Amino acid sequence: TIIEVKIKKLENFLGNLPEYATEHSAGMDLVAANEQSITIKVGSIQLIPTGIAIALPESFEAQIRPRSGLAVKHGITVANSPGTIDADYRGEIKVLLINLGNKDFIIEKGMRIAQMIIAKYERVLWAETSILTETMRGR
Amino acid sequence: SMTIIEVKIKKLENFLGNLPEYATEHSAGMDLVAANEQSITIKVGSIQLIPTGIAIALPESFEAQIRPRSGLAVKHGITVANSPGTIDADYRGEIKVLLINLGNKDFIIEKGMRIAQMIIAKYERVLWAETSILT
Amino acid sequence: MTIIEVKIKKLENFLGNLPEYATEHSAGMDLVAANEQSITIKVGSIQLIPTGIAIALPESFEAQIRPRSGLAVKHGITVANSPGTIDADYRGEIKVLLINLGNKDFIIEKGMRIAQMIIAKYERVLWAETSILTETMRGRGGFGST
Ligand SMILES: O=c1ccn([C@H]2C[C@H](O)[C@@H](COP(=O)(O)O)O2)c(=O)[nH]1
Numbered sequence: 397t398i399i400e401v402k403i404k405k406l407e408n409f410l411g412n413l414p415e416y417a418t419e420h421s422a423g424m425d426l427v428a429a430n431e432q433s434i435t436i437k438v439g440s441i442q443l444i445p446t447g448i449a450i451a452l453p454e455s456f457e458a459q460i461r462p463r464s465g466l467a468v469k470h471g472i473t474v475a476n477s478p479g480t481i482d483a484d485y486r487g488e489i490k491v492l493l494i495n496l497g498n499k500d501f502i503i504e505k506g507m508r509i510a511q512m513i514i515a516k517y518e519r520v521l522w523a524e525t526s527i528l529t530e531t532m533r534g535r
Numbered sequence: 536s537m538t539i540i541e542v543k544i545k546k547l548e549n550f551l552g553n554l555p556e557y558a559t560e561h562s563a564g565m566d567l568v569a570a571n572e573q574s575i576t577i578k579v580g581s582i583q584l585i586p587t588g589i590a591i592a593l594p595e596s597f598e599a600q601i602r603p604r605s606g607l608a609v610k611h612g613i614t615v616a617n618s619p620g621t622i623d624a625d626y627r628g629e630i631k632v633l634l635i636n637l638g639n640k641d642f643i644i645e646k647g648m649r650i651a652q653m654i655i656a657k658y659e660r661v662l663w664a665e666t667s668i669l670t
Numbered sequence: 671m672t673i674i675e676v677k678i679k680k681l682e683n684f685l686g687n688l689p690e691y692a693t694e695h696s697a698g699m700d701l702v703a704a705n706e707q708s709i710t711i712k713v714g715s716i717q718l719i720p721t722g723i724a725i726a727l728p729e730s731f732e733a734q735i736r737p738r739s740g741l742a743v744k745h746g747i748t749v750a751n752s753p754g755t756i757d758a759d760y761r762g763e764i765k766v767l768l769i770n771l772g773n774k775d776f777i778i779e780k781g782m783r784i785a786q787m788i789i790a791k792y793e794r795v796l797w798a799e800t801s802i803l804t805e806t807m808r809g810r811g812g813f814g815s816t
């Protein structure tokens with residue numbers, strides 16, 4: 397199942413629109429679009445802009461997830477993972493990276509920093525009740 | 536088209552105010568609100584479990600995901616330690632949010648603070664097919 | 671509910687039971703450590719733990735590697751690249767990247783439950799490049815908004 401998503405390139409965008417590595421990949425690589433280098437000191441969190449804004453169709457969301465390689469090699473991961481991009485968000489997509497490694501890490505424009513996976517969500521209608529069914533799991 | 540799924544929800548004794556709400560009509564998730572009666576300090580490097588005051592019964596083939604909110608992470612280094620937390624359709628206990636302070640100042644969690652977002656989605660039940668060669 | 675068949679290969683270090691759902695309505699299966707030498711995760715360190723299985727997902731399905739809440743609560747151990755993303759293109763050994771954000775060193779021994787694996791559908795995006803996106807209510811009137 398294919399979904400069309402509108403996407404706007406911002407002033408800082410470069411290159412191809414976010415790409416899937418292979419034809420069956422779940423996620424697109426997000427690329428740092430910071431106009432000046434950003435150093436993430438050990439233990440710190442930095443916001444990295446991506447230079448895109450998107451308009452997801454109704455009932456969909458985008459998830460900002462880590463690239464395993466950055467975590468393995470440098471202890472860099474997504475601080476709010478999985479980051480939720482809502483279908484009515486019209487701002488620049490931002491990636492929050494934390495440095496949990498042992499050396500300061502420089503984020504340069506063009507680096508692959510996260511992946512973005514699009515998935516369906518369901519909107520909840522609450523049915524308030526005073527008792528829930530019992531299950532084999534329980535409380 | 537969005538689709539609606541009805542989910543049963545029980546208020547526990549420590550719930551205050553309103554059932555979890557979508558910030559906007561097109562939000563993927565509902566905001567989860569701290570329901571601790573007494574403030575909870577999360578010191579630098581600590582993990583703390585925060586109650587929400589609710590229990591839910593998801594319909595079959597659905598799960599709920601406990602995810603961080605952007606503000607707590609970027610402003611305070613607070614995030615969800617077991618993210619994304621998985622709420623199973625047969626869980627009948629209180630939903631709790633496990634926060635970690637990876638920032639550089641102690642942070643006090645007060646009743647009423649938005650501490651996470653909860654996204655409901657379908658999952659698929661796997662039947663394994665054992666094989667000797669993956670194509 | 672909806673059942674999906676997934677092919678799975680036992681590698682040489684596989685010990686015993688294929689990943690199982692803890693209950694008939696659990697979203698995820700428990701993944702178990704299959705390391706043939708003990709692995710110590712020092713405080714603040716990150717270690718890759720093998721599971722001894724490889725899988726072949728059907729198209730449009732992913733497996734998400736997520737933390738078990740018990741390990742996080744009791745030991746500060748969680749999944750460093752969470753949610754780990756397994757898709758149809760990955761037929762190698764499933765590995766769990768753990769980080770120790772607790773207050774003492776933690777030894778991973780084979781047979782320990784280390785993560786849970788939730789299979790779900792994802793969508794493939796085709797981009798419609800545009801110069802004007804619709805306006806919405808989100809963030810409207812906030813400080814600094816243009
Ligand atoms: O990693 C993230 C998370 C969120 N957002 C955007 C899209 C969301 O709709 C909006 C609000 O996020 P929350 O505060 O609800 O997490 O910020 C990002 O750009 N990056």
Ligand SMILES: O=c1ccn([C@H]2C[C@H](O)[C@@H](COP(=O)(O)O)O2)c(=O)[nH]1
Nearest residue numbers: 601620621622623626630631738739
């Ligand atoms: O962030 C979380 C994760 C889990 N749970 C509840 C619902 C789950 O069904 C149950 C068991 O979680 P695990 O041990 O499978 O992580 O705990 C929560 O309240 N919050």
Ligand SMILES: O=c1ccn([C@H]2C[C@H](O)[C@@H](COP(=O)(O)O)O2)c(=O)[nH]1
Nearest residue numbers: 463464465735754755756760764765
């Ligand atoms: O928790 C994880 C995440 C990924 N992978 C597999 C599937 C991916 O295709 C491959 C490389 O990881 P990424 O660089 O795409 O994150 O490793 C795992 O074994 N476990």
